[PDB]
Amino acid sequence: METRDVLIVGGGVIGCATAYELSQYKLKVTLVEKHHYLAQETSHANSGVIHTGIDPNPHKLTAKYNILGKKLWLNTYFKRLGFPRQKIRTLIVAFNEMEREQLEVLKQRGIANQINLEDIQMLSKEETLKLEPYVNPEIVAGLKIEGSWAIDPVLASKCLALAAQQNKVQICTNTEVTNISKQVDGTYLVWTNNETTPSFKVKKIIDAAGHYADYLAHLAKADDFEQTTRRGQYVVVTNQGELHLNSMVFMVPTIHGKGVIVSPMLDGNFLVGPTALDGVDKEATRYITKDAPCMLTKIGKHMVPSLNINNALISFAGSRPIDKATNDFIIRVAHNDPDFVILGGMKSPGLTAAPAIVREAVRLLNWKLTKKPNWNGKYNLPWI
Ligand SMILES: Cc1cc2nc3c(=O)[nH]c(=O)nc-3n(C[C@H](O)[C@H](O)[C@H](O)COP(=O)(O)OP(=O)(O)OC[C@H]3O[C@@H](n4cnc5c(N)ncnc54)[C@H](O)[C@@H]3O)c2cc1C
Numbered sequence: 001m002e003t004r005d006v007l008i009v010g011g012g013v014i015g016c017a018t019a020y021e022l023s024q025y026k027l028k029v030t031l032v033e034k035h036h037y038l039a040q041e042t043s044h045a046n047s048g049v050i051h052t053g054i055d056p057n058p059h060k061l062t063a064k065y066n067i068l069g070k071k072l073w074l075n076t077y078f079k080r081l082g083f084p085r086q087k088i089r090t091l092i093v094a095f096n097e098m099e100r101e102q103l104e105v106l107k108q109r110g111i112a113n114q115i116n117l118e119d120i121q122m123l124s125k126e127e128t129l130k131l132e133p134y135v136n137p138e139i140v141a142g143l144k145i146e147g148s149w150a151i152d153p154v155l156a157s158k159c160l161a162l163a164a165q166q167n168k169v170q171i172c173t174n175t176e177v178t179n180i181s182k183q184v185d186g187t188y189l190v191w192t193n194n195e196t197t198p199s200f201k202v203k204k205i206i207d208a209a210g211h212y213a214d215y216l217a218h219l220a221k222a223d224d225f226e227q228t229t230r231r232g233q234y235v236v237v238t239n240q241g242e243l244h245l246n247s248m249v250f251m252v253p254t255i256h257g258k259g260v261i262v263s264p265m266l267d268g269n270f271l272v273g274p275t276a277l278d279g280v281d282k283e284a285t286r287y288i289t290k291d292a293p294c295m296l297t298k299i300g301k302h303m304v305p306s307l308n309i310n311n312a313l314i315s316f317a318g319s320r321p322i323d324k325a326t327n328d329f330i331i332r333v334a335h336n337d338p339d340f341v342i343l344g345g346m347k348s349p350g351l352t353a354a355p356a357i358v359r360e361a362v363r364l365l366n367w368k369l370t371k372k373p374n375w376n377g378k379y380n381l382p383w384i
């Protein structure tokens with residue numbers, strides 16, 4: 001049994017960035033993931049987009065943390081950490097006059113979310129087909145926003161963890177927390193993998209468990225929030241001939257849901273999707289189906305008609321964990337235990353927001369933390 005200051009439960013992007021941030025302090029820190037590898041769940045199955053902030057409601061923590069998180073990625077994290085990424089602008093297209101007035105609404109939303117005017121541009125039919133000649137010519141208008149990036153979220157999450165590990169954070173994989181019980185003395189005992197005796201004794205728990213972030217709070221008798229799900233399947237296609245895209249192309253999300261796209265990918269292929277299905281079991285959050293291809297064909301060819309979906313390489317899926325109560329991010333201590341920090345309901349845009357989310361996690365431990373004078377934030381993930 002290990003005595004440690006903070007146990008981070010969950011090795012997706014949120015757990016990994018948390019480990020990174022905490023690795024800069026003088027603390028005993030351990031991160032636990034149930035899978036053999038990190039980033040095998042929601043953080044593996046998403047579009048990798050660093051969103052501008054045009055999309056989220058300005059009054060929600062999704063907007064708030066988007067704004068902060070993106071700033072931290074571009075001006076801090078990207079300077080220190082090497083992993084694949086590219087700058088690529090956002091383009092939302094309208095198909096009729098109703099979708100067109102939704103573009104105006106989004107424009108205002110971006111300004112409310114502090115996007116500068118120079119980054120935003122409403123475009124006519126003609127101007128949009130100028131910029132992206134492979135888009136559907138039945139579109140009537142577009143909205144272009146500069147400032148977005150696309151990253152490999154898997155390599156980013158791993159880079160963060162390898163960085164953390166380099167600065168004394170213990171990373172234990174194949175380790176599933178199966179019980180937690182807070183003590184008279186204020187610490188927690190943590191059983192993993194249904195073992196008889198506890199493996200950890202810790203002063204704080206940072207709950208980053210994605211689809212099981214509710215399970216985990218209920219298991220410590222700390223908070224009773226519940227998450228629902230939305231499963232999204234994608235397809236990656238290749239060999240599209242002359243087809244080029246110099247934008248991430250999106251449907252109006254207000255009408256078609258969040259993040260519905262055709263994007264050129266870091267590896268030269270095209271990402272199409274996702275579908276949308278509410279309320280799948282937690283265990284089934286990543287299951288692909290035979291139904292979805294058909295849906296995906298309609299989505300992709302609606303946006304880029306010349307797209308040949310039979311040239312498919314892979315299909316995968318992931319699910320947004322969605323707070324039932326607020327349909328927003330949960331970033332707070334548990335309502336009934338101030339030593340259990342909850343990073344839950346981590347839907348879109350949790351990736352973009354991650355760095356700000358996790359810095360708030362750190363403050364929420366509520367400690368006078370002492371820095372290592374020598375702390376190494378730099379890591380270049382070897383890749384090729
Ligand atoms: C289809 C889709 C598209 C998206 N697109 C974007 C996007 O373009 N841009 C953006 O900013 N965001 C996007 N998001 C949101 C983003 O992917 C998520 O916010 C983020 O990946 C959630 O990270 P996480 O670390 O909290 O969750 P997860 O990645 O799900 O990780 C949680 C970890 O905890 C582990 N775990 C659970 N229970 C236990 C336990 N008892 N013990 C040990 N480990 C446990 C799991 O194995 C796991 O790996 C998208 C999400 C989806 C579903």
Ligand code: NI
Pocket residue numbers: 058059112
């Ligand atoms: Ni407002």
